[PDB]
């Protein structure tokens, strides 16, 4: 029954009242008197204190104190003293506390988790290092490519001295330089047929950050539905950052439930079809690190939330685009269809 003020609380005057808190839970309090009383209440909990011990020293009416305490609690501005107790993950612990979570139990779930990174290029680089430094206990890196100089625009764990080396081996070296408390392993594999997915180990979640052929995502989706394997896709369509869907067996839609994304990269007319296939074979995305990094970042966030259970991943039932040449975030609905030819009932 001791409470403490989270370190992530800040206070400002603003407009006709004030602000309490920052981020999604920031509250504007127009009533100045109420804002002042929230501050006085907040101040009682700098050190761990009971409701009654604070009510003893607050010097405002109990009616007002009760209101202020409820307000601070319902926004997780004050948290159980239990939840605040040196620690390399301590900034992440503030993030978990700010959602009303016990940060040690979240951290324990991350430590016990295994994640597969399928594809160790732009997306894979950025996701892997976030997960490693957030304390995901076991990371499996899958790729069969070598580092090229053009990769250095996005593939942040690679240096000039690394050109020609294998991607999995350099990611592993760089991850363990950043967090030597975790386990990393490599698998040299190119999934060029559906059947190669049998070589990919079961895990808490697959990060699907590989993109050849155009229908790899379709293969992965079908395999993961059949294998009861959660996955999340991320990447970009040229200048649009994409993340999601986050597929959870029996819970969310799969990639094919809703028919929003094109699946015929071709034509019913053979002459036209061959032209299309050539153009699409020659296709190289207009990669831009900022697009890459946004997609990767929000993909990693959803992995940490999926495993840590403290807040709902954004990409459940959704494939989310963030535009880079205008201000726009748009979700494609990928909710479950009872008539999905892949995952139905």
């Amino acid at each position: 029954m001791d409470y403490i003020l989270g370190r992530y609380v800040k206070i400002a005057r603003y407009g006709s009242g004030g602000l309490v808190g920052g981020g999604g839970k920031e509250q504007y309090v127009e009533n100045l008197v109420l804002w002042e009383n929230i501050i006085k209440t907040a101040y009682c909990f700098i050190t761990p204190s009971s409701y009654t011990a604070a009510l003893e020293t607050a010097n405002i009416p109990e009616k007002d104190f009760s209101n202020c305490f409820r307000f601070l609690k319902e926004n997780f501005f004050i948290i159980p003293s239990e939840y605040n107790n040196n620690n390399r993950y301590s900034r992440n612990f503030l993030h978990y506390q700010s959602y009303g979570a016990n940060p040690v139990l979240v951290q324990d779930k991350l430590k016990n988790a295994k994640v597969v990174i399928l594809g160790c290029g732009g997306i894979g680089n950025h996701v892997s290092v976030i997960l490693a430094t957030s304390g995901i206990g076991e990371i499996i890196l899958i790729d069969n490519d070598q580092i090229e100089n053009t990769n250095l625009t996005r593939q942040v764990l690679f240096s000039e001295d690394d050109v020609g080396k294998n991607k999995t081996e350099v990611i592993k070296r760089e991850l363990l330089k950043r967090n030597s408390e975790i386990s990393v392993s490599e698998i040299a594999l190119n999934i060029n047929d559906y059947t190669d997915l049998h070589k990919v180990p079961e895990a808490d979640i697959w990060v699907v950050s590989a993109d050849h052929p155009f229908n790899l995502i379709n293969w992965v989706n079908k395999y993961c539905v059949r294998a009861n394997q959660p996955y999340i896709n991320a990447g970009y369509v040229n200048d649009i950052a994409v993340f999601g869907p986050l597929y959870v067996p029996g819970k969310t839609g799969c990639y094919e439930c809703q028919k929003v994304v094109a699946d015929l990269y071709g034509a019913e007319k053979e002459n036209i079809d061959h032209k299309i296939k050539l153009i699409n074979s020659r296709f190289k995305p207009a990669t831009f690190a900022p697009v890459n990094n946004v997609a990767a970042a929000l993909c990693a966030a959803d992995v940490i939330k999926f495993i840590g259970k403290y807040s709902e991943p954004l990409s459940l039932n959704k494939r989310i685009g963030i535009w880079s040449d205008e201000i726009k975030i748009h979700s494609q609905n990928m909710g479950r269809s009872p008539v999905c030819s892949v995952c139905g009932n």
Binding site: G119, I123, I217, A234, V261, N292, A295
Partner: peptide, 7 residues
């Protein structure tokens, strides 16, 4: 974003 992504 009506086509698949690259990554």
């Amino acid at each position: 974003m009506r086509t698949g992504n690259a990554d």
